[PDB]
Every structure is written in C-alpha cells, then in structure tokens.
From a paper:
Caudovirales, the taxonomic order for the tailed double-stranded DNA bacteriophages, is characterized by the presence of a tail—a host cell attachment organelle that is connected to the genome-containing spherical or elongated capsid via a neck. We describe cryo-EM structures of the neck, the neck-capsid and neck-tail junctions, and capsid of the [name]. The tail to capsid junction involves a symmetry mismatch that is bridged by the neck, and is therefore crucial for the assembly of tailed phage. The extensive network of disulfide bonds within and between neck, collar, capsid and tail provides an exceptional structural stability to Milano.
Residue numbers in the entry:
A (entry chain AJ): 208 to 464
B (entry chain AA): 174 to 207
C (entry chain AQ), G (entry chain AP): 1 to 28
D (entry chain AK), E (entry chain AL): 1 to 137
F (entry chain AA): 260 to 464
The structure:
C-alpha cells in the first residue's frame, strides 16, 4: 500500500483591505491506495522409462523452456495482461492519453496513414515539464518511417546514402518487437486495400521511471513433486510470483489510427 | 485479518506553469505605495 | 454535513484528433 | 485472493431508491456513507438524516425517526436554518461515480436517511448504503 | 470520531429483493458480499453468481452475464453440479444477525447475484450488498 | 491521530497557491484589489493574420512566413525583445511542410530542437494556448481558432514591472484557538503594473 | 495414446508484399 497525493486545493486568494479577518481554503487529498501480487506455476510428468533410456537429455531442455516461457509470458502480461489474476497491462487500461491521426483521403477514400507530420507532431507534443520521456515502437514501423517519400521522389530522411541509420535511442527511440506492430509483418502501410487498419496502436512515448512499476518478490523454484510420482512417472512442480501496476497514466502518450 | 504492508510512496502526477518573472522589471518598495 | 468526497469509476477514451499543419496553399 | 471483507465492514441497504431502512450501529464504532446514481440527474437533491432509539416495546427494534442535529467544525461558513444535520447531492453527477460522506457525531442506535421533500423524484435514481468499522462485541 | 469510510471501503447495492445490479470490481482488488434478512424465510434460499465483460459497444457498460465457476480447495470434498459458483443461505436465519461471503477466484469486470431457480419468492425478502477494499484504479 | 501529516501538506499547498495565483493574476488580473493583468490591459501592440483561402472558402490560417515577418518587424531600436508562446505553437511551427513534402525546419532529423535562448523564444504552458488545447483545434477545417492570442514579444525589462514588499508570513491565530481547536493565518505582499505598452508586439489570428 | 507427428513436405513458399509509404497527399 502507498499514498497518492491527489491535488493541492486553493488556499489563499488576493484579498481586499477592509478585512482584518481572512478566508479558509479547502485542502487536497492523500488518497491511499493498495496493490497485490500474482502467481505463476505449473507441472509436467515424464516417463522414467522414456527418460532414462533415451537418445539424450530432455530435462535441462524443459528447465530452459520453463525459464524462457516465464520471462516471455511475464513481459507480454506486463504489456497487455488484464487485472484479473494478472498484473494490469498499461496498454489496456485506456487511461493513458491515446491519440489518432486523421485519415488522408485518397480521391474519395479517407484512408489510414502514419504521416510523418503526425509522428513529428506527437513526439513534440508532450509537456517537457515532466522531464525527458522515451518512446517505444516496433522495428517494422521504424523502417516504415525510414522509407517515406515526397511528391518528387526523394527520400525524406538521409537523402543520398540509401541507408537511414538514424542513430537511434540517442533520441528517445527504443525499438522492441513485443508491441502489436501495426504493420502486419510489413504489409499494412498499403495506401490501397493494404491500409494500416482502423484504430490500430502505432507507438508509445512515456516517462516510464514513474509511469509504470513492476514488483518482484519470488524467483523461480522447482521441486520434485513427490506424491504424483508412481515409480513409473516423475512429476516436477515449479512456481514464481510477482506483479506490476501503472503509476499514473498521465506521464505517457499512445498512438492509434 | 492479514496485514497489508506499506510501499510505493509519492505518485503525485501534478503539474504547474512556467516562470515568466525574471523577464519583468524587479522593484522592491518598502512602503505600501509608490 | 455533506463533505461529499467522491470519485468515478473507470474513465473513458482520450482520442484527440491529432490534426497537424496542412500543406501551405498560397496566400494569393 | 479477495478476503471475505463482508464479515467486517458489513454493508446494509439504506435507501433503495424509494424506501429507507433503519440500521443499527451499536455493535460498531465507526460508519460512513456510500451514494450512487443510476441515471441522469435533473437538479440538485437533498436528504435529511434521522436516528432511532430502542423502542420501549422491544429493546432491539428502532423507535421513531428523530432528526439529527448538525455539529459544526471549525472554518464553518453556513449552518442549516433549523440546525439539523442534512446532506445534498449536487447536480451533474454522472451515474458512474460513487459518493462518500460521514456525520462525525452519532446519537441513538439506528440511523436512517430520507429524501428531503421536493427533491424526491430524482431520489428514485439514487441509491444509498452504509458500511461500518468496529467490532466492540 | 467515525472516519469517512465511504472512501476507503465503499459499498453498493447488489440485490434489493426485486432485481439485480452489476457492481464494478475491476477498480478494486478485494471484495465480498454481505447478506441481510428483512424477516425469517420459509426454506433454504440459494443464489447464483455471475460476472460480466465490457461490452464491445462500450468498455464501461455491462455485457452478458457469464456464470462464474466454482473453485474448490484443499478441504473441499463437496464438489457440486457443473462446478458453478453458487451460495445458499439456510433456514433458521434471523434479522440483526448477518452473514457474509466472497468468491475465492475473480474473473470479469463486475459481479451480480440472482435468485437461483426455486428461491425467488423467498429471496424477495433478502437484501444483498457488496463491499470492496484495496482500490488501485 | 492522523495517519498522514496535514501540516506540511497545507504549508506546501499554500506556497503553491501563492506562486500560481501570483502568476495567473500578474497575467490576467482584473485590476480590482489585484495587479491588472497585462493580457487584459489591451493597449499592447497587436496584429492579426490573413484570411487564407482554400477551396474558395477562406479559413483563418497561419504560416511560418507570417511568423518570421512578425518576429523581424520589431523596432529594434527599442532593444532586444524576448518572445513568448505556448509549446503547442512551437509544435505547429516545427511541423510545417512545403508543397513538396520537405520540412521547413530541420529537414531530415525527425525533430527540430534549437536552443531557445539565442532564438529569443520562451514557453509558458498556461499562456493561453492558441490551439484549442494541443491539436484538436489546430488548423485546416473544424479547427484553428479565430481572433485568438497566438504569441507575444516585448522588452520585458521595461514593458511590465513587479513590486515585492514582504514574503510569506505564517502564524498561529491566537484569538479563537481554544484548547480544543487551533487555527493558523498567513499572508504576503506583492503587486505589479505595466510600464509602457509600446515596447512589444502581439501576434493574434 | 498416439502423438501423431506429421512433418509436411511441400514447404510451398511465402509472399511478403513489402509495402512502403505512399506519396505525400495533402491533408485536406
């Protein structure tokens, strides 16, 4: 649990002078909040006969599978997981400010487009008083940005070297591939039927050091589940538990169509 | 009956204006009129 | 003695039309 | 892992849109209020608070409905012309926004809320219930 | 000195005796039911529990009523029909002595309670409310 | 008995209301028992834009050309004049495009971030944002408001003055504070005025 | 029971359409 400063109400206005008295302003709030964690476990059974006389080992393969599945599922839940028995994904709460672009008409068809105007406008539309805030998107959409052309035919970025290589990160760009990559593969920017999709998420940009948190308590544990083993089988049990939660969904903005 | 324990602390999420004060002229009068 | 502190349930969309400077047409 | 948060903090219907219900708080030491709307409001609404004593006929049933007097805090700017406690819900409260309240001075054994006259048609779209805090027995 | 426990453990109307009402729990992380009898019943009264999902039309409007499933545990040796989450208040139940409960496993956005088939006439004289705890939003 | 401490919370809230109310009053204060806000002073040199036409349907509009003209049209003999505007205007400007597709500023860098100190421009996010909030009212059609404060520029060292007399004072109100209650009182002493509304231009729609 | 592994052979190919930003059309 933890406190949450809601606001600081108005206390003193600018008074007249025929008042030896004064005026009472209402206070703010402290708005206490709570939160919990979430579990993650499972089992499997092997056949001692198959396990022993086998081509080679299967166990360490299963242990590595456990660790990788745990990591990837944790990440995907942190991204999009619901509040029900899981940490609520910040992308799903729909309380982060999410904007969308107007669909450029194509002689009769208002059509989705991630026009470079919209991107540059978004990245520069963020209160700098919150400090710096990094942006995240898929590699495919980034490469799509690198391939934008004018009415003439020249590139819009790095004209004359056939590679944009924009020196990322150094400006707020952190590329991941867990995001829903509005470019389906690389086949969504199609001005014709291939249009990028009514209301699809494009990118994000937030000050994540205070916009979202992840709590970690329990690492992975693996026990030999005695009681399920029958001298013909073996059953292992595992588990780990942790959680996550949004800080305040006003320190980050989201893109859509 | 279980006891939730304290944590997090200081999500504030409150903003202010800029400071357009240094640009204006500064005057330090001792009395109430000038 | 109302003192009626209150909050809502879940808020609602934030889709602000991200309009942007159009093409410069021509003064004239 | 939601705990059985009903055995303590037990809630009871106070005003189901068209009927009040006296609730006994003797077994407890603290109790608040919870207001909810079900539709769109038209004008601000007002409610009067009543309390009840053990009826002489039965020591475990509420008596009559005595109006509750308002107690002023510091920094008070207005007092009800009758001096009796009362509450009011302002206009423009969308019916997805709970409301909380509490009288700091209790008296009697039963509490009740009633829609103040003239402001009872909108009260139909208003629901009120109350939780408690103490054990004391 | 009763704290305003409206905020910090609010509550809502779940079953007035005439119809159910969806009560949102997603904004919270703990919740429970409080039952109350307006009088003595005639027989054991059973209730079905339902949960909903945000309608495709709007993410803040109740959708269909999905039947929450029963979840047993270590000492549960009375697994009932089709493992559905349903409760039953027995007979020999009086006013001024409440009962409480809650579902161990959560799913959905808001919960609702309905008179299971056969208890409707008797359930017409019971009041069910829900108390929350640990709101995070 | 409180779980929290209301005292320091109230002190901070009071100082915050002091600062923010002083700025908002110094900007738009309505004269009476407060410094007259130089925005509402309404004697400060102002200039509207031109009814740009499109689809034979004129619409209020605004171009970087007009902005540069407004900047360079200052009577330099007055002295150096700092300019101020909302950040959304800076976004609108950094997002201007030619008839070809090229950015009018910082072409091929995904941004446009000069140091706004030699550029002689400053941002106040509560200076009335010409855009109806960012973007929503921005431009083209169904947007771009009208006869609205776009930006300001002045020699603020002589355009507006602020007078300071006494900082914040706080004290326990002895009278009325019984053994069951307690009450505190506070105040300060500030003000301001306009020097001469002939040292700066305003850009309006 | 029967694990029923398959290992298809044909392997018949893919058709990524590698689309890219169209030409800048004026907004409005």
């Amino acid at each position: 649990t933890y406190m949450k400063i809601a606001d600081y109400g108005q206390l003193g206005e600018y008074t007249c002078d025929a008042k030896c008295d004064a005026e009472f302003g209402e206070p703010g709030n402290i708005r206490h909040l709570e939160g919990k964690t979430y579990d993650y476990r499972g089992v499997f059974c092997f056949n001692r006969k198959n396990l022993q006389e086998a081509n080679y080992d299967f166990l360490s393969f299963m242990i590595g599978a456990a660790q990788r599945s745990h990591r990837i599922n944790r990440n995907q839940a942190l991204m999009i997981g619901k509040g029900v028995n899981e940490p609520k994904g910040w992308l799903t709460e729909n309380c982060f400010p999410v904007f969308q672009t107007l669909p450029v008409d194509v002689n009769g068809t208002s059509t989705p487009a991630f026009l470079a105007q919209d991107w540059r406008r978004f990245v520069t539309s963020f209160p700098a008083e919150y400090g710096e805030a990094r942006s995240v998107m898929h590699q495919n959409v980034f490469g799509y940005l690198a391939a934008m052309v004018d009415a003439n035919g020249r590139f819009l970025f790095g004209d004359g070297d056939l590679t944009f290589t924009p020196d990322l990160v150094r400006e707020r760009i952190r590329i991941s591939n867990c995001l829903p990559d509005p470019t389906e593969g690389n086949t969504k920017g199609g001005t014709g039927q291939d249009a990028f999709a009514a209301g699809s998420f494009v990118a994000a940009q937030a000050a994540w050091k205070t916009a979202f948190y992840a709590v970690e308590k329990r690492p992975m544990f693996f026990e030999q589940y005695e009681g399920g083993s029958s001298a013909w089988c073996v059953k292992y049990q595992f588990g780990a538990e942790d959680g996550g939660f949004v800080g305040c969904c006003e320190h980050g903005r989201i893109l859509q169509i | 009956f279980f006891t939730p324990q304290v944590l997090a602390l200081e999500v504030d999420c409150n903003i202010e204006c800029a400071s357009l004060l240094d640009l204006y002229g500064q005057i330090e009068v001792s009395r109430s009129t000038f | 003695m109302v003192k009626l502190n209150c909050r809502p349930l879940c808020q609602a969309p934030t889709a602000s039309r991200l309009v942007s400077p159009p093409c410069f047409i021509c003064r004239g | 892992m939601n705990f059985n948060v009903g055995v303590d903090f037990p809630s009871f219907i106070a005003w189901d849109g068209e009927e009040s219900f006296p609730v006994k708080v003797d077994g407890f030491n603290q109790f608040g209020f919870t207001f909810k709307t079900i539709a769109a409001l038209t004008a601000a609404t007002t409610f009067n608070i009543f309390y009840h004593e053990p009826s002489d006929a039965d020591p475990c049933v509420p008596g009559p409905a005595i109006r509750v007097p308002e107690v002023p805090f510091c920094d008070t700017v207005l007092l009800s012309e009758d001096g009796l406690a009362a509450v009011t819900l302002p206009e423009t409260v969308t019916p997805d926004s709970f409301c909380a309240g509490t009288v700091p001075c209790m008296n009697g054994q039963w509490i009740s809320i009633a829609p103040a006259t003239g402001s009872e048609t909108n009260a139909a779209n208003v629901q009120i219930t109350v939780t408690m805090k103490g054990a004391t027995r």
